[PDB]
């Protein structure tokens, strides 16, 4: 499945400067001279030295023949050595007598002649070289003449790309070998010892051409070096989406990055996805594709293929791109299949999976990903990035396919998969949803669900299983008398009795909480004198609303900000590395919902902070500072909060939680005012969050800061 992409080979060669092409031929010659030298007794370095810049003179005969020349054994001699730089097996032949020319008949010689010229050899052979008298040049002029001969040969023929790739098949690996012999590195623009290069890892000549656009192509590395020898960059979202490098397949594979053997599943899933695309003829063997492995919030990874936009320009080389969210493996589809067969992507995919493993954000960051890749190989460079040539001839790295919209697309597909649950959904009133009703949240009230919290169908995308989840009030399994809230799944035992169990691990509760991020439960109490505490599922929520049920309606309705939970989380996120500071972030957020206000790592704020509307305030005095002012500043993440903004997923959910909570209590951020009694708590909190406690803030300063943000 494939053959050689001749234009990809030919493009690499054609886009070299003339100087770099001469150098390529020069290194090929050097390789063949080394072979001649070692295989002969005297060990003369004349040709070697007269070529490698000694001022002794060495005669060469040139021919109307590509890749070929003669090294006479003496001035004007008809005997010596015939060189064919493109011959698999006879790169040099000793010509001791005329008849030696007659015995040369292989296609690797015949190919070096144009269609027009090929007839000269008659049963084809080089016997006719005996009647011709070639011109003599000094050897220092040879690589130039060979370059000009190849250009002419290509111009004499109609099939430019194929003739070019054929005529270079065996020249290129010899050139690469010649370059690896260059002591202490190849020169860059007249400066010696600049460019390290080894021949190790090269496959057969044909396989190197087959793999020219593959991620670790050795020949692409050699071409890149030749470009660097003669002279000699990171993207933003607008530039990327303006470049439009990648076209979605429209199909994706969502997998878990956690659990033992997750990495094996990801590798197999990704190789599987590539194999299916080739069979279904969505993708051709030689098409350049980006296999994206992108982390997804909740410790998941999506594999998704993209085909390169033909609008982009020429693809120069495949490679590995590292995004903040994952890696892309770029090469021809056939290169990716072969690479999977060989295990070439295993260190990369192991590294990525280990850091996506239990990521709340699906955003381990470029540095963590890069480090995890280099872990499976002491401390090497980062893998070479794929590159393309734009319309004006500039070679640039290809942007990642893991753009903003890419993830929007991923989210759409997932949500279409989630559209068949809950036979008939319950038809609840706004008052029931606000938790204002004595009858409960709309579920059926029972002993272990006294609040009547509504059951929810959790679709476990991994297990392919549906679970029914209710936020229930259960005994604190030790101390009698007190109860706590827990999300639990119901199931039938052997006898048809309904039993209940916890989420087995934080990851699953986290995913449930995201999937049902908009729903509220009463985690407080229910009855006439009692405090209902109404809280959204969103795992990034640091607020809730609450009230006391009256004989009719409610009273003391207010929004509460969870000061220390918020403080601790933000201080953690402020470091830029939450995991380093506190645990697994996913575990931290799930655990937050079970933790009381004064039981977080930070306990600095003496109480929770309260906002209420003017009309509902009762006898609470209000400030003119609004939840909206708070949200505006939080959303902007200024000054010491700046790094929180690196995790947009977390920050958007924090804000959206706040807005949903304001709305659900029948209010809005601009109609919710901070209690006078919360003043000091708020200024202390923001002072710390925004300035590390270096600046004393007041509410007016906080309101003005919000005002400044809306003005811009
Ligand atoms: Mg032509």
Author numbering: 17 to 69, 72 to 140, 158 to 267, 273 to 752
Copy the relevant paper text.
Typical signs of apoptosis were also observed in hemocytes of nigritoxin-injected shrimp and mimic cytopathological symptoms observed in animal infected by V. nigripulchritudo. This suggests that nigritoxin is a major virulence factor of V. nigripulchritudo and the hemocyte its primary target.
The crystal structure of the nigritoxin was solved by the single anomalous diffusion (SAD) method, using a selenomethionine-labeled protein and refined at 2.1 Å resolution. The C-terminal domain of nigritoxin contains two interesting and not yet described structural features: residues 512–544 form two large loops, each composed of two antiparallel strands that project out of the globular surface like “rabbit ears”. The bases of these protruding loops appear to be stabilized through a hydrophobic stacking of the side chain of Arg512 with the side chain of Trp540. The second feature is located on the concave side of the second, larger β-sheet, where four histidine residues and one arginine are concentrated in a groove with maximal distance of 10 Å creating a large and positively charged patch at the protein surface that has yet to have a defined biological function. Comparative analyses with Blast against PDB, DALI, Phyre2, or ProFunc revealed that neither the structure of full-length nigritoxin nor that of its individual subdomains resembles any known fold or protein structure, meaning that to date this protein structure is an “orphan”, making the identification of an active site difficult. On the other hand, deletion of the protruding loops eliminated toxicity, as did replacement with alanine of two histidine residues (His598 and His650) that are suspected of contributing to a functional “hotspot”.
